[PDB]
Structure formats: C-alpha cells, structure tokens
Design a protein around this ligand. Structure first.
Ligand code: HEM
Ligand code: HEM
Lengths: 294, 104
C-alpha cells in the first residue's frame, strides 16, 4: 500500500574520517585472510552479501532492502537463498566489533564497496545512514531470484527494484567474481579466469566460449565451457535476448563504460528505499589502501 | 612451506599469465623456467621492457620474497600488473612451489 519511509541518519557524530577506517579495516583483513576459497579471498562473497541484503527490496511497499540490516536475524540469515553468505558475515563481525557504532547495514553495504574497489574495480560512492531495524522488519525468505530462468524472468525480477535493462546487465557483470559452489547454490564452477580481479571478462566469456549444456550432481543444468568456466541459465539469457545482447557486446568491448555503469547501478542497488535528507553528507569516495600507501 | 599450497597460489594469481616449464609458451608473461639463478628480462623470446632486463638482478628466494610484496615498487615502469602478495607465509609458499615447478 502506502509505504514506510526510511531516513538515513549519520551514526552520531561520525565523520568521513571515521568511515575510511571502517573501510581500511576491511581492506586490510581482505589481504590478511586471502586464503579462503582457494586464494580467491573474501572479496567476491562480500560483493554478494551486499547484494543479498539490498536485493530483498520491494518498491511497492518499500520493504526489505539494505536499511534495517535484518540479515543479522535468524529468518533472513537462514534463508536458503543466502547460503554461503554466512562466511562473509563472520569475516565482517570482528570488524563490527572494532567499530561498534556502525550500523549492520552500513557495515554490510560498505563491505561490498570495499571489495569492489580493492579488486582493481571502479570507485563507488557510498552513503552512511542506514539504521538497524527491529527483528520484525525482516522480510520473508524468498524475494531473491532463481538461477534457472530466462531473460523474461530476469527482466521482470529487476523491475521490483526499479532496475532497467542497462542496469541489470551492468550488475550481472559482477559474476566475473567468485564462483558457484555445488554445496551452497546447487551449482559448481567459476565464470572465468581471474575471479578475484574486477574486469569485464564475464561478457567476453559469454560471447566467446563454447557453452555446452550439462547437468550436475545437484541435478541442475548449467552451461559449461571446456575452458573450465560455467554460466548459470540466467547469465545465459543476457545473450538469448537482443536487448540485453546489445548491451553485453557494448560492455564486452569497453570496460571503462562497463565500469561506469556499475558504480552507478551498484550504489543505486545499495540505496533503494533510503531517504537521504539535506542535512546529509554527500556520497564519500573512499581511498583504497594503494592510495594511502598502506 | 608447501608447493602443495604453493601450487594453488600460482594457478590462482599468476598462471593466467605464465607457463613454468621450458617450452612453456609465453602468454602475456614469459615462461618461468630458469628462474632461480637468473637475471631480469631473461626469458629468450619475450618482449621485455628496458626497465625489466635492466633491473639487472638474479632471481633468488629472498629476491622474490621482496618482489612479491610489490612488483611495481621493486621495478618501476613494468607490464606485470599484479599488486604483489603482501603476506610472508604465502609469498613463502609460492616461492617454494616455484623452485620445483620452474626447473624440474
Ligand atoms: C540475475 C540474478 C542473479 C542470480 C540468479 C544469481 C545467482 C548466484 C548463485 C546461485 C551464485 C553461487 C552461490 C554459491 O554457490 O555460493 C552466485 C554467486 C555470486 N553472485 Fe550472483 N546472482 C544474481 C545476481 C548477482 C548480482 C546482482 C551480483 C552483484 C552485485 C552478483 C554477484 C555474485 C558474486 C560476486 C558471486 C560469487 C560468490 C562467491 O564466490 O561466494 N550476483 N550468484
Ligand atoms: C602471482 C604470481 C606471479 C609470479 C610469481 C610472477 C613472476 C614474474 C617474474 C619473476 C617476472 C620477471 C621475469 C624476469 O625478469 O626474469 C614476471 C614478469 C611479468 N609477469 Fe608475472 N608473475 C606473477 C603473476 C603475474 C600476473 C597475474 C600477470 C598478469 C598479467 C603477470 C604478468 C607478467 C608480465 C606482463 C611480466 C613482464 C614485465 C615486463 O618485462 O615488462 N604476472 N612475472
């Protein structure tokens, strides 16, 4: 019906200078703990908690999202759709303990910004102000997408979060990162070769490899290259549709564009449902470790 | 430590650019056979950068141990786009694996 509003609010007296610290802390651990998932590190999973928390939004009633940071509660936390993410959460926690005043929600989304930027990806503007909401604000499991459908389902899925085709394609390029785990999602395989470096490989892998449909031990089917990459059914739609297709080629060709479209859409992703006052600070652009010479 | 664990390191952060066996084609990077006890810009067939050959140094354990922290740092204007490994354990684990893999 007529929705709820969530207005941002800076964590009492926190500056841009406190935030970079939260940032750094994460960047430094990201480098400490790079052993996880065969030297992939926790980056990828962080780009994905970010999204899983954000991805529960519903522009209809303005529920779910990144704001209340409800992932910290047993229903969201245990959504079968979130399988895998508990690893990135336990990576975040000690950090949350060093900076007790940050909202789960800012922690979660900052989490994702840090990772992107640290994996040689584009700078992403971020806004502090998400405030932790009472356990009764956790949406029901199941607002996240399935990986077994078509361009159809994918176009429609993103409409509940005001995303257009240029924006969903651009977010999907985040699949250059990490991989699928038979044990959590019923899928096994990486999308390409550098899975902890931020680039547009997704799109070229799509465009250039010899996808072959095969079925797995989870008994799902997935496209497999003989190069040792995979493409979910839904990552395959991007080429099975002329609209999405047009865009794939465009990003396959120019990374600086791909990159330009991602920061935009990613932050849009992180910001749906949040009302940013006047007496509000603009998006911050944190400095990577490499620029502070850390 | 391990070549075992050192092996994983390699596939993951570098094999996208180098072969280790003699008669390993050079991809964006030289073959890495003949590493330990060799000079910079050493690989016969690769279009090194002055900057490289000219670092003019022997490719040795600790030498790597340094390099591996900051490829850029240790050698200005190069083409190897890697941000180094910063830890010592895994820099150590990759160094092991290499002694093997890059000779016999
Ligand atoms: C079209 C909607 C999407 C579907 C159906 C989908 C599905 C999946 C599945 C099943 C996995 C593997 C789970 C596991 O085995 O751990 C995965 C991994 C991942 N997803 Fe997607 N996802 C979608 C959108 C996104 C978006 C929008 C982003 C980024 C903003 C993203 C980023 C990632 C990353 C980085 C990984 C690797 C995770 C890891 O390595 O732990 N995905 N996705
Ligand atoms: C992470 C593990 C890696 C190791 C141990 C490693 C090792 C090395 C070493 C020792 C050299 C100098 C050769 C000599 O002068 O004798 C070199 C050069 C080079 N490597 Fe790597 N490398 C690694 C990763 C990478 C990656 C990920 C790339 C990606 C492109 C890459 C591309 C190159 C290039 C382009 C050069 C030549 C620089 C020049 O001469 O301009 N390497 N590598």
């Amino acid at each position: 019906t007529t929705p709820l509003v969530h207005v941002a609010s800076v964590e009492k007296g926190r500056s841009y200078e406190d935030f970079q610290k939260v940032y750094n802390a994460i960047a430094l651990k990201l480098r400490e703990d790079d052993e996880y998932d065969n030297y992939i590190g926790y980056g990828p999973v962080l780009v994905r908690l970010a999204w899983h928390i954000s991805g529960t939004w519903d522009k209809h009633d303005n529920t779910g999202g990144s704001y209340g940071g409800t992932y910290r509660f047993k229903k969201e936390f245990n959504d079968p759709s979130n399988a895998g993410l508990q690893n990135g959460f336990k990576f975040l926690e000690p950090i949350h303990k060093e900076f007790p005043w940050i909202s789960s929600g800012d922690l979660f989304s900052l989490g994702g910004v840090t990772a992107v930027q640290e994996m040689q990806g584009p700078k992403i503007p971020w806004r502090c102000g998400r405030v932790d909401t009472p356990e009764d604000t956790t949406p029901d499991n199941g607002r996240l997408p399935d990986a077994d459908k078509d361009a159809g389902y994918v176009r429609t899925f993103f409409q509940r979060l005001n995303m257009n085709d240029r924006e969903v394609v651009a977010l999907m390029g985040a699949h250059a990162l990490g991989k699928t785990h038979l044990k959590n999602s019923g899928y096994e395989g990486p999308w390409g070769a550098a899975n902890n470096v931020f680039t547009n490989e997704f799109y070229l892998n799509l465009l250039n490899e010899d996808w072959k449909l095969e079925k797995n031990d989870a008994n799902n089917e997935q496209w497999d290259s003989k190069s040792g990459y995979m493409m979910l059914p839904t990552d395959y739609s991007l080429i099975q549709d002329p609209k999405y297709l047009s865009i794939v080629k465009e990003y396959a060709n120019d990374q600086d564009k791909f990159f330009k479209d991602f920061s935009k859409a990613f932050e849009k992703l992180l910001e749906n449902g949040i009302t940013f006052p006047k007496d509000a600070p603009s998006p911050f652009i944190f400095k990577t470790l490499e620029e502070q010479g850390l | 430590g391990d070549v075992e664990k050192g092996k994983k390191i390699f596939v993951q952060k570098c094999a996208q650019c180098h072969t280790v066996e003699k008669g390993g084609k050079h991809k964006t990077g030289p073959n890495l056979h003949g590493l330990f006890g060799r000079k910079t810009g050493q690989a016969p067939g690769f279009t090194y950068t002055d900057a490289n050959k000219n670092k003019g140094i022997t490719w040795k354990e600790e030498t790597l141990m340094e390099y591996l922290e900051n490829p850029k740092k240790y050698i200005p204007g190069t083409k190897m786009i890697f941000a180094g490994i910063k830890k010592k354990t895994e820099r150590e684990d990759l160094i092991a694996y290499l002694k093997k893999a890059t000779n016999e």
